[PDB]
RNA sequence: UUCCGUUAACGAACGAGACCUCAGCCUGCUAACUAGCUAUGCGGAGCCAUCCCUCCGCAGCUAGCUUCUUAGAGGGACUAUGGCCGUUUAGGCCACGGAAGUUUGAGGCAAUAACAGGUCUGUCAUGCCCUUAGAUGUUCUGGGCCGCACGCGCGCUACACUGAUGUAUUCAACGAGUAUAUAGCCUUGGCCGACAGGCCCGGGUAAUCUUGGGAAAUUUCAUCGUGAUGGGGAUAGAUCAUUGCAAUUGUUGGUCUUCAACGAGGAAUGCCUAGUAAGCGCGAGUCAUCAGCUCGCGUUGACUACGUCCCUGCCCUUUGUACACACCG
RNA sequence: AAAAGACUUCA
């Protein structure tokens, strides 16, 4: 029913359907801007 | 000169120490090359028919001097210092270095001689006999430096 | 060093003789012939040689004064 | 001149192991209490409380060695659609603060976990 | 450039002097201590700024009346 | 004491004949002058005195830049060190004196700045406050030295050295002295 | 015994100096100082204060300056040597000050922001 | 250095070609003309006579032979006391007339 | 570094769950081997409701997704210690007027009509443009102070979002509040803090 | 709109300044073998051969040690002081102290309101419209963006001897190692390979191990000799490895061979005012593989101005306006 | 100071 497969390469997140994407945050780096505003990374707490 | 023998190993200018020390290595029974050389041993130019004045004895001498002070240093430490092997812009290319076989082979000859022993994870270690060989020769070197 | 042809004689034209490190006149002569090999088999590399456009995937976005002919005014 | 036969030999205690005795002779001390918090003020406060516990126990152990900064530091203009200026500087500093004790008794272990002053400080009783 | 007094500094400097005056001095170092007693200022540089400005004013007062300071 | 400046040359042996030039070439610093590599806030005050001077320090820094690309302070010190001994042995006189002589000769009185005003471009000349004279003389010397080096077997230290002696003699063989009188000629005439 | 370290500071990189006032050696990294930096005007910076001073045998300096390039190395050692002897002698107060010491700069490498090709030198267009 | 021409479409600009070769040297040094008399009497002695000490590199330009030609010659002469050579990192040195 | 990634994933759990969510906020403190996970809502009663099934559905799911140990966890009801500071209800209440309608402008005013009531000192409510389905031209309303951006870190800023889907046009929102500091006293308005003493016949005098 | 003062206006709020972040100065404060330095021994090396001297170990111990490192909490600058100038004020200029006199230096916040700026291709945010089994869904296979007679921008590399080549010197900083499967993500060490690379062990989800981040510029001893030069490294062909099932319009790297234009760039035009210009490397990001890129970081480091508004953009007055679609009027 | 001119519709 299915055919032939082979097609490893750049995985891709759930959050972005985009070739480039992040392991760190589970985001994209445009999605990341939202998270940057939120802080979200430990030892970081806004307003820089 | 006799008083000088211990201290001089350190306090002398390294470049001219290597030039002096290399002559002493000509005396040694080793200096075995076994035909590893032929394809292109080193950077560009220095495939090793020119090696007898230019390259070989000074290569051996530099390794010998360094191991004394810096002791516990293995093959990978030697490769980088003599080498460049920095990432090119792809437009640059200049030389392409080697050094992995080269360092291994010379260090092996020194081990046969009894200069070097192998720390099991710490790299190559200078022996007591190796230190004696370095320091005794260095006595003679002091005269021209000073 | 040496340099010696090998493989079953079956294949008609060329082979490569094993990266010519014989050198002097012989390598220079073979250099011209090597382009003809690619043309003869009818590889895309040979089609590119035939056209006069440089083969080995350079940018061509601009630059092509080298690539097939010199700087001639406009375009198309 | 000469003559040294060495090991450690004059008896025990190192900066690695805070030697103590009883408990079938205690040769077990090496606990690391590692404090990872969002806010530095809370993190520092936690360390002070740990020092108090050590003093109470039997033997007061050494104070914090607060170690290093770890940075994931991001400037990306998220998109303009052709923007090459005016990015935004959100940088993450993070510190891991390590307090060793002179004696990690069974008593020390239980008190540290049960009353733990961390609100957003996560401080870990942790492996050899 | 740089070193002009702000409105926040101007209001505070007059007020401290007015109702602390006998204790206040021409001396910079002691009047730094006074600002700890009279207010909490969060950073170091704020304390030094106010202390310096007030002492300059204290000199002027003891050499002729100052426009907005009455003791 | 055995004061340095390459540990071969004194600098209080330099007598600066032009009195006005002497005051703006400081040959003595707070303990005495020397050449050692350092750093130095020289600001950008004008009119009046505006910096302390070491002749060698000014020389090395100008060489590092002008005659473009590559160079370093350490590289520039190296060529200067070589050049000074060459000059010293060719004049049989302290080489610091020779450069001071060169600077005063090769320092024009007046300039020929490009200012466009109304319907024409006038050069009426503008100031050349004396540190600017020092820099300008060396700059002209450097471009001359560079030209020779490019297509001929001569090290830049030697190229510079020859011109320096020539400039300190009014000899138009030097690039710098030739250009000094070029600027003045146009500036004065077209007033 | 005798080993007193007075921290100068001035440019990146820090020299921890155990100094004993005695015999006239200069060392850094357990090797003689002018030979270490041979053929350099910057070696003479270090040598400046054990020449100009009139004092030779007054410092056996052992110096270790650790971890960043060979170029930096000279400067720090000079300053420490002045200060150590200054504690003893009240006449060599005018020796530390007047032979010039102490600039950290306070402008030690600045931040790189976007738009910069290097950090402060903006791109060739934009 | 001189500037350049200008571009054209096809073209590229150069403008300068150099002074051009003379002083091939080392070949000439080995053969008898320069090995015997010519270098010692004509070239080597006379430039230091004019100005008592002269650097090698200035003299190279005047005589119009390369440096390496006299590299060997300077060593032979210096032993005699005819020349005084020095040192330098960039290998610069002197030709000197007489000691005394 | 790796620990920082782990922390970020824990925060992500709150973001997904408390996306839409018609209650109000969730601070979380993590005690040994259990998560306290505290809901800070008026209608914290409905979401729990005790025993049932409801409470177990909330917990279990989160654990299998992301945390450690086949065990239970904890869930706590809380009041609100000023509804200003942080919420989710603050945005949702405005949405619950942009249902059945009433003037959009009037609804904006009503949110502010609260907030200042519970202290605040300044408030800015800002409601998405496109009144009468025209082009966007966002409308303010503000009384007092209010610093989202400018002055110090510790302004205590409420911020949210939401959307209201009409036939013709979206009406966004972003309720914003600059309130007090954490109720216990620790007030510090706008970073430099002036203060005097009372009156100078001294031998006693000191204050702050 | 920083302030004083005149003062039909008084007193506020917003922006900015302030603040926040980050770089400075402290054998101060508090600590630390998961960071160091000393002191002490020193098994260990060398020399006087003899104590000693000198070197050596991220342990040989100790420390009453914290200078660096690390990070918490402080104080430190307020143009202090003195003198000039000024309504004798707000101030500005200089001298001295001082680490710093300059909003402390450098960044971040940077508004009300405006723009039919840009993004429906960040998002199961979304109105409306279409489409929707012969899909504009989705999945699979293959190709594209790489196409080139030529215009433009960001860039890269040069024209050389302040340089290339070849030995030689041999020293880091900001960061980061996701279970990734049978050691796999970073990889030291040992073999083997000229290279690229392979292989076997081991440590490390990390102040520890990788990493003294032993990096490049630079630095030194030769070669060269001013030559389209061996500078430059183009285009091309063969061959071998690495990643991927697969490498082609050569993914990338190397080897062999080819040995370009370029001899300092015009009309024009950008950026820059002492840790900045220029040269120089690196890590992180995208990532199976691919960086001439970006974003930070170290390193080497100025000539010239510290003035003015000519050029240029905008702000406050007065003045003009037939403009308001606002001079592209 | 004389080198400065044009410039679609809904608007």
Name the overall outline of chain A: rod-shaped
Distance between the termini of chain A: 55 Å
* Number of H- or I-type helical stretches of chain C: 2
Element order, helices and strands of chain A? Answer: H
Structural class of chain C: mainly alpha
| Rg over alpha carbons of chain A | 16 Å
Query: Helical amount among residues of chain A, as a percent range?
Result: 10-25%
Tally of contiguous helical segments of chain A: 1
Shape estimate of chain C = elongated
Oligomer: part of a larger assembly
Percent in strands of chain A? under 5%
Tally of strands of chain C: 0
What is the gyration radius of chain C calculated from CA atoms? 17 Å
Report the major sheet of chain C.
none
The run of helices and strands of chain C is HH
Structural class of chain A: little secondary structure
Number of strands of chain A: 0
- Note the beta-strand portion of chain C: under 5%
The pair of chains with the biggest contact is: F-H, 19 and 20 residues
User: For the terminal residues of chain C, how far apart are their CA atoms?
Assistant: 53 Å
Question: Can you lay out the helices and strands and say which pair or pack?
Answer:
This is part of a larger assembly, with nine protein chains of nine kinds.
Chain A: H1 32-38
Chain E: H1 7-18, H2 28-38, H3 44-61
Chain F: H1 19-22, H2 55-65, H3 73-91, H4 95-105, E1 115-117, E2 120-122, H5 131-151, H6 156-167, H7 175-189
Helix pairs in contact in F: 2-3, 2-5, 3-6, 4-6, 5-6, 5-7
Chain B binds two RNA strands through helix 1, helix 2, helix 4, helix 5 and helix 6.
Question: How would you portray this structure in words?
Answer:
It is classed as ribosome. The structure is cut from a larger assembly and holds nine protein chains of nine kinds. Chain A is built from one helix and no strands. Chain A is largely without helices or strands. Chain A is rod-shaped and about 55 Å long. Chain B has a two-stranded antiparallel sheet with strand order 1-2. In chain B, a hairpin with a 3-residue loop joins strand 1 and strand 2. With 126 residues, chain G is an alpha+beta fold. A three-stranded mixed beta sheet of chain G has the order 2-4-3, with no helix packed on it. Chain H has four helices and two strands. In chain H, 22% of the residues are buried. At the F-H interface, helix 3, helix 5 and helix 6 of F face strand 1 and helix 3 of H. Chain B binds two RNA strands through helix 1, helix 2, helix 4, helix 5 and helix 6.
What's the short version?
In chain C, helix 1 crosses helix 2.
Observed structural traits:
part of a larger assembly, 9 chains, A: 48 residues, little secondary structure, D: 128 residues, alpha+beta, 4-stranded antiparallel β-sheet, 6 strands, 21% helix, RNA-binding, Putative ribosomal protein S18 (chain C), cytoplasm (chain C), RNA binding (chain C)
